């Protein structure tokens, strides 16, 4: 009947259903549905077999065990539907099916080209895709694909898994766009092939092998980092693992890739891979032994974690085993207390407590330095507590146990260990202001003002007025001596153990960037007013900046830049200067001379 009639019966019978209804009240096949949004109505076993429902909007609506069979679905939005159970067979579907339900659904011979989903995949569990035509994106897992009828495909947007077929008409025209778990899952021919069941292997690496037909050395020349990663994580594991073809393939490309990544992350902390990339990752270094020593930070955080994961374990403590031969490690591998602590020379691969000094380290300079620790320690390092144990390797020169007291640490880890140094570096900056804060003000309440005042780059506090004014004179006295530091303050300040073993240059650019903070406390946008800056703030920051001086004066470049300085925090020559300006005069000159330490101690919300 007519449009508005067969709709309002539809709607009605939903808002009055029973669930014992009749075929004459449910038969609404070779109807034309067309063009109508059936929204989230309960639609439970009804019949449409034959019908038409293209460009229909069925979100949120309740197919369940309905019978849609030769129906034609074409344009129309099918998200969150409950297709459970349902009849689908030799269906049209070219559609959004964003979470739509098909568990159970017989989807025998049906169609999918040009259908689409963003991020949750449609829903195929125990469903009959038995010569049905998938696109790349769709997950099998569970999928009921069918037994192999032919086992290769003539057509050539196709490519046969088990009974059912891989349509790629609708990819962008560019195969590599099927080829992204990272940032393309949803259009990932590699998810499709990979979320089949395991009956269906053999037909897996078939279809891998003509997958890679129609990839050309031009589609794989650039970096490609997303698409070559997921090659690596999805054709590196059983059942693709034990095939001549696909590992030949793969061989120049992920050699070609992990050189790259290797390379670029050296002396950084590395980052996580799956199984595929990882046991490439680790064949890289079996096929160059050079690379063990060249990228020695890599190659270590890549053992380590192939050393303890299921399945690679074995073949990773064997290249491991390999190293340990190798010339400027071997003397390490004989210290009483390496591995298992047995003159084998051999790590100790059954330790739960990841307290066995397995790990050995090799300088990134000529010096002949050497590490050896454990991984509880190293994994600590790379990402340290202020409880972390910084002193807890053994440390050699020349295969000679040294004692680690006579080294400069910050040194020893910025140029023979880098790895370390940022995680180093971080840690002791990161707590270092409130730390000054903790020293100088024992009012929790005024230290309170300054520590949050360090999260916002303007504060609508000020410390102007006269009381205001007469509290910093009483907490900052004992720590002035006119405009310098008092001696004893500068002992405690510069007395930090870890502070005390940074090299000079390093502590007069902390030091100046401290002076750099307290101008900046004083300013119009902070404590201070357009019109007046505490002049105690002042006293402070150049007290700081005249140690600086003394500590290492090159830091300030020419003296002519320092006496600028002291003159407008000190007011000499008549030089009347607000403190915003001086603030920047201050921290344009640290981000230009000292960048890395200017990031790392000047607070991130001021800069």
Known sequence: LSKAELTADLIWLSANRTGEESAEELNYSGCDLSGLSLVGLNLSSVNFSGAVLDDTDLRMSDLSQAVLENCSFKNSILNECNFCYANLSNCIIRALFENSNFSNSNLKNASFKGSSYIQYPPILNEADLTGAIIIPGMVLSGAILGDVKELFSEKSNTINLGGCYIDLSDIQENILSVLDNYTKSNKSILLTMNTSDDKYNHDKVRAAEELIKKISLDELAAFRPYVKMSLADSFSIHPYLNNANIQQ??????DDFFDTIMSWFN????????????????????????????????????????????????????????????????????????????????????????????????????????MMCSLSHMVDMLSPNTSTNWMSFF???????????????????????PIFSIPYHKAFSQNFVSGI????????????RFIEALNSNKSDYKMIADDQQRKLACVWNPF????????????????????????????AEILFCLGGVFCKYSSSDMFGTEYDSPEILRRYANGLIEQAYKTDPQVFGSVYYYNDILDRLQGR????????????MLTEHAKESFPEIFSLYYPVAWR
Not at 442 to 448: G, Q
């Open 249 to 254: 393939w793969l061989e120049p490309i992920c």
């Open 267 to 370: 002396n950084s902390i590395m980052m996580y891979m799956e199984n595929g990339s990882l046991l490439q990752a680790g064949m890289y270094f079996e096929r160059h032994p050079g690379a063990m020593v060249s990228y020695n930070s890599s190659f270590i955080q890549i053992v380590m974690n192939g050393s303890r994961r299921d399945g690679m374990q074995e073949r990773f403590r064997e290249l491991y085993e390999v190293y340990l031969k190798n010339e400027k490690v071997y003397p390490v591998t004989q210290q009483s207390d390496f591995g298992l602590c047995d003159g084998s020379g051999k790590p100790d691969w059954d330790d739960d407590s990841d307290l066995a000094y397995n790990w050995v380290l090799l300088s990134s300079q000529d010096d002949g330095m050497a």
């Open 395 to 417: 440390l050699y020169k020349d295969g000679e146990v040294q004692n680690t007291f006579g080294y400069s640490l910050s040194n020893l880890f910025s140029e023979s260990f």
């Open 437 to 448: 804060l903790d020293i100088l003000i024992s009012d929790n309440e005024l230290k309170e």
């Open 480 to 507: 002035l001596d006119g405009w310098e530091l008092n001696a004893q303050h500068v002992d405690m300040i510069m007395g930090s153990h870890v502070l005390k073993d940074m090299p000079l240059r390093k502590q």
């Open 573 to 584: 020559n008549n030089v009347f200067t607000c403190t915003a300006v001086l603030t920047d």
